């Protein structure tokens, strides 16, 4: 997590898209969908991030209805945005063992325990937190079982970004999981 507001200049596709969907948040306005391929994925905005301005405009007290709006109403051109890096997630990291475990269990993205003398327990990892990210990937919508496959097929050292719950269940919020699964991109970031 990037301590910092930063700015980023998007360009509509061919299409007219940026691949973006908004969502309002404690009158704030945080990214709900980064689809693949898309100018949002390509400057890099990340799920969980927040919008302070777009073109300059101020976002607070912003509907998301509303941003989606003012996204459609821009100039493709040049589409100026200040954004907030994820400030609602946390990175831990932690070293896998002997027998390849970092020390906890998780079902449907929420941790729900950690284990004894794991690193998960010496770093400090909580229950009740959505995993976000994996070693810089988004694992969002991704089965348990894929989540879990990227675990084992990363290296020793593992860094997670989480949630709590009750914020990721807000923000997700009228979004079926498909949409998640399918589209919400998925990609290690390209150079």
Known sequence: IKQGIREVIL??????????RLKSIDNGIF?????????????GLRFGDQVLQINGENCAGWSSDKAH???????GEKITMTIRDRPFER????????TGHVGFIFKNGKITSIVKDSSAARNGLLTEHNICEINGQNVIGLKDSQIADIL?????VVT?????????????????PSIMKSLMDHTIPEV
């Open 11 to 20: 360009c509509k596709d061919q299409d007219g898209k940026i691949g973006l």
């Open 31 to 43: 990214v709900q969908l980064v689809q693949a391929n898309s100018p949002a994925s390509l400057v």
């Open 69 to 75: 709006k003012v996204l459609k109403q821009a100039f």
């Open 91 to 98: 990175t831990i990291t932690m070293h896998k063992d002997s």
């Open 152 to 156: 084992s097929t990363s290296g020793t």
């Open 160 to 176: 997670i970004t989480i949630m709590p719950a009750f914020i990721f269940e807000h923000i997700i919020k009228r979004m079926a």
